[PDB]
Amino acid sequence: GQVSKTYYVSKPGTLISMMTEEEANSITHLTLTGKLNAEDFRHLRDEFPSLKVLDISNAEIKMYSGKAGTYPNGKFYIYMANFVPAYAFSNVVNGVTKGKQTLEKVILSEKIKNIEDAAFKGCDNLKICQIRKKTAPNLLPEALADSVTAIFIPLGSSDAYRFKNRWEHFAFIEGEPLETTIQVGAMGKLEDEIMKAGLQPRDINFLTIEGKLDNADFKLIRDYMPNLVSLDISKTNATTIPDFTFAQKKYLLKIKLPHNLKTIGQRVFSNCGRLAGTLELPASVTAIEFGAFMGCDNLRYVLATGDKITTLGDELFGNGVPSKLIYKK
C-alpha cells in the first residue's frame, strides 16, 4: 500500500538505527529479512506509527537477554530464539494495555517456535496473522485473540493447527489472505466488478463494497464467499439483506451493515457464531425477519439505533434465548 520498504537486518536489535525517524514514521508495509531480536520488536511496537503490515516471514528471531526488549517496565528478560517475544506489540502503560492499533497484518516465518505471552494483546485491528509454518507454533496466553484475528496457514495445514492448545477456536483459512474494496456502479454487478479486479469471489476474505448492492450481489456473497472474514457494506445503497445471506459464514468475524438498511431477511445471520459484542443496526431498519440471529451464540446484543422497527419475526435469537435486542431510543 501507502509506503512499502524492505530492510535486511544484519545484526539483531539494529533495525531502528538503519533509517531516520522520518523514514520509519512513514512506513505502512514493512518487510524484514535477516536477524531480529526483541529490541527490534520494541522499536516496531513503540515507534513505526504508520506500520500496518509487518512481513517477517524471511527473518530470523535471535535470542536476546536484557532490558531493551518488549517486556514492560524495562524489566530484565530472556527472549528465546525463534520466539515472537512476550508483549511484542503490546505494552502496559500505567496499568492500561496499549496494543499497536495500526497493525493489521503480520506474516510469520516457518521458524517461529513460540508466540509468547500477550504478543498481540490489544492489537484490535490485527485482522491477519499469516503463519508460513505447516504446524502451529506454541501460542501463549493472550498472544492472539480468536475474536479478532483470522489465521492464514499453508494449504493442508488446518489439522496441524486447529487441535493445538489455545488454537482451537481461531478462524483458520488456508492459503493467502485477500483484502479488497470493490466499487459497484448503479447498473454494475458485484460479480463483474470482482472479475474486473482480477479476483475470484471464493478467494475474498476481507471485503469492502461501495456503491450499489442488490439481491443478485447478495446471492454471490451468500453462495460464493465461504472464506469471508469481514464485510463492510456500510457505503452501499442496499435496503434489504435477503434470506440466509450470511448463514453459511463460518469465518465471519465482522460486518458493517448498509447505512440505509430497512429489512433483515429470514435467518440472515443464521449460525454466525463469531460475531461478538453488540451488532449495531442502522436507524432505518423497520423489519427483522424470522430467526435472523439464530446460532449467533457469541453475539451479546443487537442494538437498534432508530425507532423505526415495526416488524420483528419469530425466534430472532433461537429457541428459548432471551431477546438480545436493545434500543438507543
Side-chain angles (χ1 to χ4, degrees), residues 179-229:
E179 178 182 352
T180 189
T181 300
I182 298 294
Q183 303 300 311
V184 186
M187 236 58 191
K189 289 186 188 172
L190 176 63
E191 180 163 13
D192 297 358
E193 294 306 323
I194 288 167
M195 202 195 185
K196 284 179 192 170
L199 309 172
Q200 285 297 118
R202 204 178 212 274
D203 292 336
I204 298 172
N205 308 115
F206 305 93
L207 183 59
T208 301
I209 312 172
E210 303 185 339
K212 194 227 78 192
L213 249 202
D214 62 21
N215 291 352
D217 300 325
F218 279 116
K219 194 168 171 175
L220 187 77
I221 294 163
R222 180 194 168 186
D223 302 327
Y224 294 98
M225 260 175 245
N227 299 332
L228 190 62
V229 178

mmCIF file of all heavy atoms in Angstrom, residues 179-229:
data_model
loop_
_atom_site.group_PDB
_atom_site.id
_atom_site.type_symbol
_atom_site.label_atom_id
_atom_site.label_comp_id
_atom_site.label_asym_id
_atom_site.label_seq_id
_atom_site.Cartn_x
_atom_site.Cartn_y
_atom_site.Cartn_z
ATOM 1 N N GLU A 179 -7.680 -9.099 0.778
ATOM 2 C CA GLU A 179 -8.450 -7.945 1.200
ATOM 3 C C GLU A 179 -8.708 -7.097 -0.023
ATOM 4 O O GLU A 179 -7.775 -6.817 -0.776
ATOM 5 C CB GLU A 179 -7.737 -7.140 2.287
ATOM 6 C CG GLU A 179 -8.529 -5.893 2.682
ATOM 7 C CD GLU A 179 -7.932 -4.968 3.721
ATOM 8 O OE1 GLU A 179 -6.892 -5.327 4.318
ATOM 9 O OE2 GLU A 179 -8.516 -3.882 3.941
ATOM 10 N N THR A 180 -9.963 -6.684 -0.230
ATOM 11 C CA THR A 180 -10.265 -5.874 -1.405
ATOM 12 C C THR A 180 -11.439 -4.934 -1.150
ATOM 13 O O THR A 180 -12.292 -5.184 -0.300
ATOM 14 C CB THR A 180 -10.502 -6.786 -2.646
ATOM 15 O OG1 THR A 180 -10.577 -5.976 -3.811
ATOM 16 C CG2 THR A 180 -11.736 -7.677 -2.525
ATOM 17 N N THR A 181 -11.452 -3.846 -1.916
ATOM 18 C CA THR A 181 -12.509 -2.854 -1.931
ATOM 19 C C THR A 181 -13.043 -2.860 -3.340
ATOM 20 O O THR A 181 -12.276 -2.675 -4.286
ATOM 21 C CB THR A 181 -12.011 -1.473 -1.451
ATOM 22 O OG1 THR A 181 -11.527 -1.614 -0.111
ATOM 23 C CG2 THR A 181 -13.110 -0.420 -1.477
ATOM 24 N N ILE A 182 -14.343 -3.087 -3.479
ATOM 25 C CA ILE A 182 -14.985 -3.169 -4.786
ATOM 26 C C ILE A 182 -15.996 -2.047 -4.915
ATOM 27 O O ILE A 182 -16.843 -1.880 -4.039
ATOM 28 C CB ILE A 182 -15.644 -4.577 -4.995
ATOM 29 C CG1 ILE A 182 -14.596 -5.732 -4.972
ATOM 30 C CG2 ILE A 182 -16.531 -4.645 -6.250
ATOM 31 C CD1 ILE A 182 -13.522 -5.774 -6.152
ATOM 32 N N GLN A 183 -15.893 -1.295 -6.012
ATOM 33 C CA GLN A 183 -16.798 -0.200 -6.393
ATOM 34 C C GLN A 183 -17.850 -0.745 -7.342
ATOM 35 O O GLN A 183 -17.490 -1.279 -8.394
ATOM 36 C CB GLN A 183 -16.023 0.940 -7.091
ATOM 37 C CG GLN A 183 -14.868 1.545 -6.294
ATOM 38 C CD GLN A 183 -15.325 2.148 -4.991
ATOM 39 O OE1 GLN A 183 -16.286 2.929 -4.932
ATOM 40 N NE2 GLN A 183 -14.646 1.786 -3.920
ATOM 41 N N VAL A 184 -19.137 -0.645 -6.986
ATOM 42 C CA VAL A 184 -20.188 -1.168 -7.874
ATOM 43 C C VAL A 184 -21.100 -0.008 -8.272
ATOM 44 O O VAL A 184 -21.714 0.612 -7.405
ATOM 45 C CB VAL A 184 -20.987 -2.377 -7.275
ATOM 46 C CG1 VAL A 184 -21.958 -2.964 -8.306
ATOM 47 C CG2 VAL A 184 -20.051 -3.463 -6.765
ATOM 48 N N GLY A 185 -21.149 0.278 -9.571
ATOM 49 C CA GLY A 185 -21.986 1.324 -10.153
ATOM 50 C C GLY A 185 -23.451 0.925 -10.143
ATOM 51 O O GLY A 185 -23.773 -0.257 -9.962
ATOM 52 N N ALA A 186 -24.352 1.913 -10.323
ATOM 53 C CA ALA A 186 -25.817 1.755 -10.295
ATOM 54 C C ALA A 186 -26.336 0.646 -11.240
ATOM 55 O O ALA A 186 -27.334 0.000 -10.919
ATOM 56 C CB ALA A 186 -26.489 3.076 -10.635
ATOM 57 N N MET A 187 -25.664 0.422 -12.379
ATOM 58 C CA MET A 187 -26.045 -0.595 -13.358
ATOM 59 C C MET A 187 -24.988 -1.737 -13.421
ATOM 60 O O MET A 187 -25.055 -2.601 -14.303
ATOM 61 C CB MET A 187 -26.240 0.075 -14.743
ATOM 62 C CG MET A 187 -27.612 -0.171 -15.380
ATOM 63 S SD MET A 187 -29.147 0.400 -14.310
ATOM 64 C CE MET A 187 -30.543 -0.468 -15.368
ATOM 65 N N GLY A 188 -24.050 -1.729 -12.475
ATOM 66 C CA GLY A 188 -22.999 -2.731 -12.388
ATOM 67 C C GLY A 188 -23.406 -3.977 -11.629
ATOM 68 O O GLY A 188 -24.535 -4.087 -11.141
ATOM 69 N N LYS A 189 -22.482 -4.937 -11.549
ATOM 70 C CA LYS A 189 -22.661 -6.218 -10.867
ATOM 71 C C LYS A 189 -21.443 -6.502 -10.025
ATOM 72 O O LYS A 189 -20.327 -6.385 -10.517
ATOM 73 C CB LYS A 189 -22.879 -7.368 -11.877
ATOM 74 C CG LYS A 189 -24.214 -7.353 -12.602
ATOM 75 C CD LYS A 189 -24.366 -8.598 -13.451
ATOM 76 C CE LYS A 189 -25.581 -8.538 -14.339
ATOM 77 N NZ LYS A 189 -25.613 -9.675 -15.295
ATOM 78 N N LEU A 190 -21.642 -6.864 -8.762
ATOM 79 C CA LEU A 190 -20.527 -7.200 -7.864
ATOM 80 C C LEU A 190 -19.641 -8.289 -8.496
ATOM 81 O O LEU A 190 -18.419 -8.176 -8.458
ATOM 82 C CB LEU A 190 -21.074 -7.677 -6.494
ATOM 83 C CG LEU A 190 -20.066 -8.154 -5.463
ATOM 84 C CD1 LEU A 190 -19.107 -7.041 -5.051
ATOM 85 C CD2 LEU A 190 -20.770 -8.772 -4.269
ATOM 86 N N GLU A 191 -20.263 -9.320 -9.083
ATOM 87 C CA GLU A 191 -19.583 -10.442 -9.722
ATOM 88 C C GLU A 191 -18.650 -9.957 -10.842
ATOM 89 O O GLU A 191 -17.490 -10.379 -10.899
ATOM 90 C CB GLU A 191 -20.612 -11.443 -10.258
ATOM 91 C CG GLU A 191 -19.988 -12.648 -10.942
ATOM 92 C CD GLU A 191 -20.853 -13.869 -11.166
ATOM 93 O OE1 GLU A 191 -22.093 -13.768 -11.021
ATOM 94 O OE2 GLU A 191 -20.281 -14.931 -11.500
ATOM 95 N N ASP A 192 -19.142 -9.044 -11.692
ATOM 96 C CA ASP A 192 -18.379 -8.493 -12.814
ATOM 97 C C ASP A 192 -17.265 -7.591 -12.319
ATOM 98 O O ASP A 192 -16.170 -7.629 -12.872
ATOM 99 C CB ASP A 192 -19.293 -7.709 -13.772
ATOM 100 C CG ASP A 192 -20.376 -8.522 -14.467
ATOM 101 O OD1 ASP A 192 -20.426 -9.754 -14.255
ATOM 102 O OD2 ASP A 192 -21.177 -7.922 -15.225
ATOM 103 N N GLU A 193 -17.529 -6.800 -11.260
ATOM 104 C CA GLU A 193 -16.525 -5.886 -10.705
ATOM 105 C C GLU A 193 -15.393 -6.665 -10.031
ATOM 106 O O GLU A 193 -14.234 -6.256 -10.145
ATOM 107 C CB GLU A 193 -17.147 -4.859 -9.747
ATOM 108 C CG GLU A 193 -18.100 -3.890 -10.438
ATOM 109 C CD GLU A 193 -17.571 -3.123 -11.642
ATOM 110 O OE1 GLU A 193 -16.381 -2.731 -11.641
ATOM 111 O OE2 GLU A 193 -18.354 -2.919 -12.598
ATOM 112 N N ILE A 194 -15.719 -7.810 -9.396
ATOM 113 C CA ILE A 194 -14.711 -8.694 -8.784
ATOM 114 C C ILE A 194 -13.819 -9.266 -9.900
ATOM 115 O O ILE A 194 -12.597 -9.256 -9.761
ATOM 116 C CB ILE A 194 -15.360 -9.803 -7.920
ATOM 117 C CG1 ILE A 194 -15.924 -9.198 -6.619
ATOM 118 C CG2 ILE A 194 -14.376 -10.961 -7.646
ATOM 119 C CD1 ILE A 194 -16.855 -10.135 -5.844
ATOM 120 N N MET A 195 -14.438 -9.748 -10.993
ATOM 121 C CA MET A 195 -13.746 -10.296 -12.161
ATOM 122 C C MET A 195 -12.830 -9.251 -12.819
ATOM 123 O O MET A 195 -11.722 -9.596 -13.230
ATOM 124 C CB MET A 195 -14.755 -10.822 -13.186
ATOM 125 C CG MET A 195 -14.156 -11.849 -14.150
ATOM 126 S SD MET A 195 -15.294 -12.130 -15.695
ATOM 127 C CE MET A 195 -14.295 -13.586 -16.584
ATOM 128 N N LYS A 196 -13.290 -7.981 -12.904
ATOM 129 C CA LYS A 196 -12.517 -6.869 -13.485
ATOM 130 C C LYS A 196 -11.306 -6.537 -12.610
ATOM 131 O O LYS A 196 -10.275 -6.133 -13.138
ATOM 132 C CB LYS A 196 -13.385 -5.617 -13.674
ATOM 133 C CG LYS A 196 -14.335 -5.680 -14.853
ATOM 134 C CD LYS A 196 -15.173 -4.415 -14.939
ATOM 135 C CE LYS A 196 -16.326 -4.540 -15.907
ATOM 136 N NZ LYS A 196 -17.254 -3.382 -15.800
ATOM 137 N N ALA A 197 -11.414 -6.755 -11.278
ATOM 138 C CA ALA A 197 -10.323 -6.534 -10.329
ATOM 139 C C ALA A 197 -9.283 -7.666 -10.430
ATOM 140 O O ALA A 197 -8.224 -7.580 -9.813
ATOM 141 C CB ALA A 197 -10.876 -6.435 -8.905
ATOM 142 N N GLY A 198 -9.582 -8.687 -11.234
ATOM 143 C CA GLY A 198 -8.727 -9.851 -11.447
ATOM 144 C C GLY A 198 -8.814 -10.839 -10.300
ATOM 145 O O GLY A 198 -7.874 -11.605 -10.057
ATOM 146 N N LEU A 199 -9.954 -10.832 -9.577
ATOM 147 C CA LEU A 199 -10.132 -11.692 -8.414
ATOM 148 C C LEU A 199 -11.205 -12.756 -8.602
ATOM 149 O O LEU A 199 -12.001 -12.700 -9.538
ATOM 150 C CB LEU A 199 -10.465 -10.826 -7.174
ATOM 151 C CG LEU A 199 -9.524 -9.645 -6.877
ATOM 152 C CD1 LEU A 199 -10.079 -8.792 -5.773
ATOM 153 C CD2 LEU A 199 -8.111 -10.104 -6.534
ATOM 154 N N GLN A 200 -11.190 -13.755 -7.712
ATOM 155 C CA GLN A 200 -12.179 -14.826 -7.644
ATOM 156 C C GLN A 200 -13.001 -14.610 -6.377
ATOM 157 O O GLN A 200 -12.397 -14.424 -5.316
ATOM 158 C CB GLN A 200 -11.519 -16.223 -7.654
ATOM 159 C CG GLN A 200 -10.970 -16.685 -9.012
ATOM 160 C CD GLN A 200 -12.034 -16.848 -10.078
ATOM 161 O OE1 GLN A 200 -12.005 -16.166 -11.099
ATOM 162 N NE2 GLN A 200 -13.017 -17.724 -9.862
ATOM 163 N N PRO A 201 -14.356 -14.592 -6.447
ATOM 164 C CA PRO A 201 -15.159 -14.377 -5.217
ATOM 165 C C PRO A 201 -14.794 -15.302 -4.062
ATOM 166 O O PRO A 201 -14.707 -14.830 -2.940
ATOM 167 C CB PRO A 201 -16.592 -14.655 -5.664
ATOM 168 C CG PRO A 201 -16.581 -14.390 -7.126
ATOM 169 C CD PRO A 201 -15.221 -14.754 -7.636
ATOM 170 N N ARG A 202 -14.555 -16.592 -4.322
ATOM 171 C CA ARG A 202 -14.204 -17.574 -3.285
ATOM 172 C C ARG A 202 -12.920 -17.207 -2.508
ATOM 173 O O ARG A 202 -12.760 -17.634 -1.369
ATOM 174 C CB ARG A 202 -14.035 -18.982 -3.896
ATOM 175 C CG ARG A 202 -14.258 -20.078 -2.857
ATOM 176 C CD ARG A 202 -14.145 -21.500 -3.390
ATOM 177 N NE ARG A 202 -15.043 -22.399 -2.658
ATOM 178 C CZ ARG A 202 -14.733 -23.017 -1.521
ATOM 179 N NH1 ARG A 202 -13.542 -22.835 -0.961
ATOM 180 N NH2 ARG A 202 -15.618 -23.806 -0.925
ATOM 181 N N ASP A 203 -11.991 -16.485 -3.142
ATOM 182 C CA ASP A 203 -10.731 -16.116 -2.513
ATOM 183 C C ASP A 203 -10.872 -14.945 -1.556
ATOM 184 O O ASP A 203 -9.978 -14.733 -0.758
ATOM 185 C CB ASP A 203 -9.695 -15.761 -3.594
ATOM 186 C CG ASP A 203 -9.269 -16.951 -4.425
ATOM 187 O OD1 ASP A 203 -9.381 -18.095 -3.927
ATOM 188 O OD2 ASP A 203 -8.825 -16.742 -5.576
ATOM 189 N N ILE A 204 -11.957 -14.174 -1.651
ATOM 190 C CA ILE A 204 -12.142 -12.953 -0.856
ATOM 191 C C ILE A 204 -12.372 -13.246 0.645
ATOM 192 O O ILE A 204 -13.261 -13.998 1.027
ATOM 193 C CB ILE A 204 -13.264 -12.078 -1.451
ATOM 194 C CG1 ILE A 204 -12.872 -11.629 -2.894
ATOM 195 C CG2 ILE A 204 -13.548 -10.860 -0.526
ATOM 196 C CD1 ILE A 204 -13.957 -10.906 -3.682
ATOM 197 N N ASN A 205 -11.536 -12.625 1.476
ATOM 198 C CA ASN A 205 -11.611 -12.757 2.918
ATOM 199 C C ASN A 205 -12.048 -11.462 3.561
ATOM 200 O O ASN A 205 -12.809 -11.492 4.510
ATOM 201 C CB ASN A 205 -10.252 -13.177 3.482
ATOM 202 C CG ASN A 205 -9.695 -14.389 2.805
ATOM 203 O OD1 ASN A 205 -8.667 -14.322 2.148
ATOM 204 N ND2 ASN A 205 -10.426 -15.495 2.857
ATOM 205 N N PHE A 206 -11.532 -10.330 3.096
ATOM 206 C CA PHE A 206 -11.868 -9.033 3.699
ATOM 207 C C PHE A 206 -12.416 -8.172 2.590
ATOM 208 O O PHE A 206 -11.683 -7.827 1.676
ATOM 209 C CB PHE A 206 -10.635 -8.407 4.398
ATOM 210 C CG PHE A 206 -10.041 -9.346 5.415
ATOM 211 C CD1 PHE A 206 -9.008 -10.219 5.064
ATOM 212 C CD2 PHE A 206 -10.545 -9.398 6.717
ATOM 213 C CE1 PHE A 206 -8.495 -11.137 5.990
ATOM 214 C CE2 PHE A 206 -10.013 -10.295 7.652
ATOM 215 C CZ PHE A 206 -9.005 -11.174 7.278
ATOM 216 N N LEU A 207 -13.728 -7.916 2.612
ATOM 217 C CA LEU A 207 -14.360 -7.187 1.545
ATOM 218 C C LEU A 207 -15.015 -5.913 1.999
ATOM 219 O O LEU A 207 -15.764 -5.881 2.979
ATOM 220 C CB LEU A 207 -15.419 -8.092 0.875
ATOM 221 C CG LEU A 207 -16.189 -7.532 -0.347
ATOM 222 C CD1 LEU A 207 -15.257 -7.143 -1.493
ATOM 223 C CD2 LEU A 207 -17.156 -8.538 -0.854
ATOM 224 N N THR A 208 -14.770 -4.871 1.231
ATOM 225 C CA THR A 208 -15.443 -3.607 1.374
ATOM 226 C C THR A 208 -16.171 -3.384 0.070
ATOM 227 O O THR A 208 -15.573 -3.461 -0.989
ATOM 228 C CB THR A 208 -14.468 -2.491 1.744
ATOM 229 O OG1 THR A 208 -13.837 -2.855 2.964
ATOM 230 C CG2 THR A 208 -15.153 -1.122 1.893
ATOM 231 N N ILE A 209 -17.458 -3.145 0.142
ATOM 232 C CA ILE A 209 -18.231 -2.826 -1.058
ATOM 233 C C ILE A 209 -18.720 -1.421 -0.907
ATOM 234 O O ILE A 209 -19.207 -1.044 0.156
ATOM 235 C CB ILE A 209 -19.402 -3.783 -1.375
ATOM 236 C CG1 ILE A 209 -18.964 -5.259 -1.308
ATOM 237 C CG2 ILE A 209 -20.010 -3.434 -2.771
ATOM 238 C CD1 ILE A 209 -20.125 -6.266 -1.419
ATOM 239 N N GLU A 210 -18.593 -0.649 -1.979
ATOM 240 C CA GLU A 210 -19.081 0.721 -2.032
ATOM 241 C C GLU A 210 -19.948 0.854 -3.273
ATOM 242 O O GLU A 210 -19.599 0.315 -4.330
ATOM 243 C CB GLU A 210 -17.911 1.720 -2.046
ATOM 244 C CG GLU A 210 -16.968 1.579 -0.859
ATOM 245 C CD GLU A 210 -15.858 2.602 -0.736
ATOM 246 O OE1 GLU A 210 -15.514 3.241 -1.755
ATOM 247 O OE2 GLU A 210 -15.323 2.759 0.386
ATOM 248 N N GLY A 211 -21.064 1.558 -3.129
ATOM 249 C CA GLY A 211 -21.965 1.848 -4.244
ATOM 250 C C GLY A 211 -23.253 1.058 -4.219
ATOM 251 O O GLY A 211 -23.989 1.093 -3.238
ATOM 252 N N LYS A 212 -23.530 0.336 -5.302
ATOM 253 C CA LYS A 212 -24.762 -0.426 -5.444
ATOM 254 C C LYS A 212 -24.617 -1.852 -4.939
ATOM 255 O O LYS A 212 -23.638 -2.532 -5.236
ATOM 256 C CB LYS A 212 -25.207 -0.427 -6.912
ATOM 257 C CG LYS A 212 -26.637 -0.898 -7.132
ATOM 258 C CD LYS A 212 -26.732 -1.908 -8.255
ATOM 259 C CE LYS A 212 -26.287 -3.256 -7.784
ATOM 260 N NZ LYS A 212 -26.094 -4.215 -8.884
ATOM 261 N N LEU A 213 -25.618 -2.301 -4.187
ATOM 262 C CA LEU A 213 -25.731 -3.649 -3.679
ATOM 263 C C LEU A 213 -27.174 -4.083 -3.781
ATOM 264 O O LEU A 213 -28.035 -3.487 -3.142
ATOM 265 C CB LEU A 213 -25.267 -3.717 -2.217
ATOM 266 C CG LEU A 213 -23.986 -4.451 -1.865
ATOM 267 C CD1 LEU A 213 -24.006 -4.842 -0.428
ATOM 268 C CD2 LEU A 213 -23.723 -5.662 -2.756
ATOM 269 N N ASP A 214 -27.453 -5.084 -4.595
ATOM 270 C CA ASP A 214 -28.803 -5.604 -4.781
ATOM 271 C C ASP A 214 -28.845 -7.125 -4.440
ATOM 272 O O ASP A 214 -27.814 -7.706 -4.071
ATOM 273 C CB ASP A 214 -29.290 -5.318 -6.224
ATOM 274 C CG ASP A 214 -28.520 -5.954 -7.371
ATOM 275 O OD1 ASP A 214 -27.820 -6.964 -7.138
ATOM 276 O OD2 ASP A 214 -28.652 -5.466 -8.510
ATOM 277 N N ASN A 215 -30.020 -7.750 -4.615
ATOM 278 C CA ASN A 215 -30.274 -9.163 -4.330
ATOM 279 C C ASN A 215 -29.327 -10.124 -5.061
ATOM 280 O O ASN A 215 -28.824 -11.043 -4.420
ATOM 281 C CB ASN A 215 -31.741 -9.517 -4.619
ATOM 282 C CG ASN A 215 -32.673 -8.853 -3.628
ATOM 283 O OD1 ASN A 215 -32.247 -8.239 -2.638
ATOM 284 N ND2 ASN A 215 -33.962 -8.923 -3.878
ATOM 285 N N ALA A 216 -29.035 -9.892 -6.355
ATOM 286 C CA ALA A 216 -28.116 -10.742 -7.115
ATOM 287 C C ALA A 216 -26.689 -10.639 -6.544
ATOM 288 O O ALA A 216 -25.980 -11.639 -6.451
ATOM 289 C CB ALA A 216 -28.138 -10.363 -8.602
ATOM 290 N N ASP A 217 -26.291 -9.446 -6.090
ATOM 291 C CA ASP A 217 -24.964 -9.264 -5.495
ATOM 292 C C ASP A 217 -24.890 -10.006 -4.161
ATOM 293 O O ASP A 217 -23.901 -10.683 -3.892
ATOM 294 C CB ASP A 217 -24.645 -7.770 -5.334
ATOM 295 C CG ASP A 217 -24.638 -6.947 -6.619
ATOM 296 O OD1 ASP A 217 -24.215 -7.485 -7.681
ATOM 297 O OD2 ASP A 217 -24.961 -5.744 -6.549
ATOM 298 N N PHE A 218 -25.971 -9.953 -3.360
ATOM 299 C CA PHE A 218 -26.006 -10.678 -2.096
ATOM 300 C C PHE A 218 -25.969 -12.199 -2.304
ATOM 301 O O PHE A 218 -25.364 -12.904 -1.491
ATOM 302 C CB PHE A 218 -27.236 -10.295 -1.291
ATOM 303 C CG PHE A 218 -27.076 -8.996 -0.540
ATOM 304 C CD1 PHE A 218 -27.866 -7.900 -0.845
ATOM 305 C CD2 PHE A 218 -26.133 -8.872 0.479
ATOM 306 C CE1 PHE A 218 -27.747 -6.714 -0.124
ATOM 307 C CE2 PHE A 218 -26.017 -7.687 1.196
ATOM 308 C CZ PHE A 218 -26.826 -6.614 0.887
ATOM 309 N N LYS A 219 -26.574 -12.700 -3.388
ATOM 310 C CA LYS A 219 -26.561 -14.132 -3.738
ATOM 311 C C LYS A 219 -25.114 -14.582 -4.011
ATOM 312 O O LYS A 219 -24.726 -15.682 -3.605
ATOM 313 C CB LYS A 219 -27.470 -14.382 -4.944
ATOM 314 C CG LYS A 219 -27.806 -15.838 -5.211
ATOM 315 C CD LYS A 219 -28.946 -15.981 -6.227
ATOM 316 C CE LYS A 219 -29.095 -17.428 -6.634
ATOM 317 N NZ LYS A 219 -30.263 -17.633 -7.530
ATOM 318 N N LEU A 220 -24.301 -13.713 -4.662
ATOM 319 C CA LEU A 220 -22.881 -14.010 -4.882
ATOM 320 C C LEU A 220 -22.157 -14.125 -3.540
ATOM 321 O O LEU A 220 -21.358 -15.022 -3.351
ATOM 322 C CB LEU A 220 -22.211 -12.936 -5.746
ATOM 323 C CG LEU A 220 -20.779 -13.254 -6.167
ATOM 324 C CD1 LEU A 220 -20.765 -14.269 -7.321
ATOM 325 C CD2 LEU A 220 -20.038 -11.996 -6.517
ATOM 326 N N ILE A 221 -22.455 -13.231 -2.605
ATOM 327 C CA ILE A 221 -21.827 -13.262 -1.276
ATOM 328 C C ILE A 221 -22.295 -14.522 -0.532
ATOM 329 O O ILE A 221 -21.486 -15.222 0.099
ATOM 330 C CB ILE A 221 -22.152 -11.963 -0.491
ATOM 331 C CG1 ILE A 221 -21.507 -10.732 -1.167
ATOM 332 C CG2 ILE A 221 -21.727 -12.088 0.988
ATOM 333 C CD1 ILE A 221 -22.126 -9.360 -0.697
ATOM 334 N N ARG A 222 -23.590 -14.805 -0.599
ATOM 335 C CA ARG A 222 -24.127 -15.957 0.088
ATOM 336 C C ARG A 222 -23.523 -17.274 -0.442
ATOM 337 O O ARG A 222 -23.052 -18.085 0.355
ATOM 338 C CB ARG A 222 -25.658 -15.979 -0.008
ATOM 339 C CG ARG A 222 -26.253 -17.181 0.700
ATOM 340 C CD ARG A 222 -27.690 -17.383 0.316
ATOM 341 N NE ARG A 222 -28.143 -18.683 0.784
ATOM 342 C CZ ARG A 222 -29.331 -19.204 0.511
ATOM 343 N NH1 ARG A 222 -30.209 -18.527 -0.222
ATOM 344 N NH2 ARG A 222 -29.660 -20.392 0.980
ATOM 345 N N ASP A 223 -23.480 -17.454 -1.765
ATOM 346 C CA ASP A 223 -23.044 -18.722 -2.323
ATOM 347 C C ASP A 223 -21.594 -18.865 -2.712
ATOM 348 O O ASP A 223 -21.151 -20.006 -2.802
ATOM 349 C CB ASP A 223 -23.902 -19.056 -3.544
ATOM 350 C CG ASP A 223 -25.394 -19.131 -3.264
ATOM 351 O OD1 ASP A 223 -25.770 -19.540 -2.146
ATOM 352 O OD2 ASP A 223 -26.183 -18.832 -4.182
ATOM 353 N N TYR A 224 -20.853 -17.774 -2.961
ATOM 354 C CA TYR A 224 -19.501 -17.949 -3.484
ATOM 355 C C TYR A 224 -18.410 -17.273 -2.671
ATOM 356 O O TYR A 224 -17.334 -17.027 -3.204
ATOM 357 C CB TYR A 224 -19.445 -17.474 -4.952
ATOM 358 C CG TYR A 224 -20.282 -18.361 -5.844
ATOM 359 C CD1 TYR A 224 -21.577 -17.999 -6.201
ATOM 360 C CD2 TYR A 224 -19.811 -19.605 -6.261
ATOM 361 C CE1 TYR A 224 -22.388 -18.852 -6.948
ATOM 362 C CE2 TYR A 224 -20.602 -20.454 -7.036
ATOM 363 C CZ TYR A 224 -21.887 -20.069 -7.383
ATOM 364 O OH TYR A 224 -22.671 -20.890 -8.155
ATOM 365 N N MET A 225 -18.670 -17.004 -1.379
ATOM 366 C CA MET A 225 -17.700 -16.375 -0.488
ATOM 367 C C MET A 225 -17.648 -17.102 0.841
ATOM 368 O O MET A 225 -17.984 -16.522 1.887
ATOM 369 C CB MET A 225 -18.033 -14.904 -0.296
ATOM 370 C CG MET A 225 -17.177 -14.027 -1.155
ATOM 371 S SD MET A 225 -17.702 -12.214 -1.020
ATOM 372 C CE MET A 225 -18.292 -11.968 -2.896
ATOM 373 N N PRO A 226 -17.249 -18.404 0.844
ATOM 374 C CA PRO A 226 -17.265 -19.151 2.118
ATOM 375 C C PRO A 226 -16.202 -18.693 3.106
ATOM 376 O O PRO A 226 -16.385 -18.907 4.288
ATOM 377 C CB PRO A 226 -17.025 -20.598 1.681
ATOM 378 C CG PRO A 226 -16.248 -20.476 0.422
ATOM 379 C CD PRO A 226 -16.822 -19.283 -0.274
ATOM 380 N N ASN A 227 -15.118 -18.051 2.621
ATOM 381 C CA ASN A 227 -13.991 -17.652 3.448
ATOM 382 C C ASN A 227 -14.016 -16.173 3.789
ATOM 383 O O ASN A 227 -12.971 -15.614 4.110
ATOM 384 C CB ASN A 227 -12.674 -18.021 2.742
ATOM 385 C CG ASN A 227 -12.510 -19.499 2.493
ATOM 386 O OD1 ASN A 227 -13.038 -20.330 3.222
ATOM 387 N ND2 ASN A 227 -11.772 -19.854 1.452
ATOM 388 N N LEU A 228 -15.207 -15.559 3.753
ATOM 389 C CA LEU A 228 -15.411 -14.175 4.138
ATOM 390 C C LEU A 228 -15.233 -14.021 5.655
ATOM 391 O O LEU A 228 -15.939 -14.656 6.438
ATOM 392 C CB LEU A 228 -16.805 -13.753 3.699
ATOM 393 C CG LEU A 228 -17.131 -12.275 3.803
ATOM 394 C CD1 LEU A 228 -16.199 -11.430 2.879
ATOM 395 C CD2 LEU A 228 -18.610 -12.045 3.487
ATOM 396 N N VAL A 229 -14.279 -13.176 6.059
ATOM 397 C CA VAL A 229 -13.960 -12.941 7.457
ATOM 398 C C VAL A 229 -14.580 -11.627 7.906
ATOM 399 O O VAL A 229 -15.059 -11.494 9.043
ATOM 400 C CB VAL A 229 -12.417 -12.962 7.687
ATOM 401 C CG1 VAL A 229 -12.068 -12.674 9.155
ATOM 402 C CG2 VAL A 229 -11.807 -14.298 7.253
#
